[PDB]
Amino acid sequence: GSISTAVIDAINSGATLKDINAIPDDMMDDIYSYAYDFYNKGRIEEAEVFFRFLCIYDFYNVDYIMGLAAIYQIKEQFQQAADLYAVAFALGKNDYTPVFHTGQCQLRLKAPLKAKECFELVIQHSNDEKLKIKAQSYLDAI
Amino acid sequence: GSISTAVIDAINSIPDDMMDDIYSYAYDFYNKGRIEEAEVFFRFLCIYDFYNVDYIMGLAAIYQIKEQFQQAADLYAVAFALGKNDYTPVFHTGQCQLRLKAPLKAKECFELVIQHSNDEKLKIKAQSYLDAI
Ligand SMILES: N=C(N)c1ccc(C(F)(F)F)cc1
Numbered sequence: 001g002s003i004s005t006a007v008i009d010a011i012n013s014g015a016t017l018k019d020i021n022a023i024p025d026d027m028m029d030d031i032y033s034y035a036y037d038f039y040n041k042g043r044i045e046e047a048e049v050f051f052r053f054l055c056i057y058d059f060y061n062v063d064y065i066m067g068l069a070a071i072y073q074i075k076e077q078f079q080q081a082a083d084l085y086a087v088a089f090a091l092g093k094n095d096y097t098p099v100f101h102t103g104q105c106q107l108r109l110k111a112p113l114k115a116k117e118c119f120e121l122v123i124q125h126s127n128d129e130k131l132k133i134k135a136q137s138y139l140d141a142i
Numbered sequence: 143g144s145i146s147t148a149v150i151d152a153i154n155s156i157p158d159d160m161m162d163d164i165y166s167y168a169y170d171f172y173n174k175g176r177i178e179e180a181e182v183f184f185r186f187l188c189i190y191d192f193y194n195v196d197y198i199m200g201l202a203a204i205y206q207i208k209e210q211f212q213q214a215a216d217l218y219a220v221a222f223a224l225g226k227n228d229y230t231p232v233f234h235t236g237q238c239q240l241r242l243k244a245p246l247k248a249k250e251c252f253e254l255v256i257q258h259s260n261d262e263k264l265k266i267k268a269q270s271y272l273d274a275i
């Protein structure tokens with residue numbers, strides 16, 4: 001692991017714990033797999049702890065961010081979820097799935113024009129026709 | 143950075159005119175070549191209101207000037223996700239990806255501009271990069 005001075009330096013420098021290899025890679029994989037297990041088992045509170053832990057460890061990991069965003073969406077913290085989905089989109093650049101879920105969140109936030117803009121962005125830019133079918137099903141419902 | 147601040151804020155939990163004032167001051171610094179002071183002001187603005195495309199775009203431009211190409215690209219992508227209709231961030235992401243030795247990502251950015259932007263001057267610029275790729 002990392003000595004305390006190295007962890008403190010990372011806190012003070014704005015760096016991730018990932019950047020200083022504070023926990024072995026295999027253990028982080030285990031933690032992600034357990035977080036997914038909790039999620040799939042309906043243990044949302046525990047899944048939330050684990051996805052928060054993962055995102056503290058590496059705020060630039062798209063899948064860690066996507067997991068927490070999904071949990072926030074389930075818990076109806078729609079603005080926090082939308083905020084994380086936007087970050088997740090930016091980090092991956094290529095995948096419009098977070099923009100699709102942002103659209104769902106915006107509908108629940110009573111921002112239907114923002115939602116429409118999200119679904120249209122998916123339709124116009126994604127080459128994933130299966131995702132477009134889902135986005136189009138929201139757009140057609142208006 | 144600004145992205146890490148946005149993520150940490152989400153993990154854990156001023157009149158528009160005044161914000162407009164500070165944005166203009168940051169631009170004033172930028173235009174005089176006071177890049178470091180402009181960067182502080184844009185970083186401040188992105189802490190106060192990160193999901194504001196004008197603040198993101200200004201900070202991303204400074205990172206691009208400073209050859210911090212990955213940070214710039216990440217911020218331009220946020221701006222595009224939030225704004226959706228302006229392809230200027232996609233165009234600059236393409237430039238950044240070229241400098242990051244990611245020519246296929248760059249090509250995808252410039253193609254998006256040509257296919258979707260209504261900014262004819264931006265489309266010429268994107269095509270000139272494509273011709274070099
Ligand atoms: N419906 C089409 N003809 C069509 C064209 C382009 C794309 C894109 F390249 F954007 F993925 C997706 C679908």
Ligand SMILES: [Cl-]
Nearest residue numbers: 002003004005
């Ligand atoms: Cl120690």
Ligand SMILES: [Cl-]
Nearest residue numbers: 091092093215
């Ligand atoms: Cl990238």
Ligand SMILES: [Cl-]
Nearest residue numbers: 111112113114
């Ligand atoms: Cl709206």
Ligand SMILES: [Cl-]
Nearest residue numbers: 228229259261
């Ligand atoms: Cl444009």
Ligand SMILES: [Mg+2]
Nearest residue numbers: 256257258259
């Ligand atoms: Mg056109």
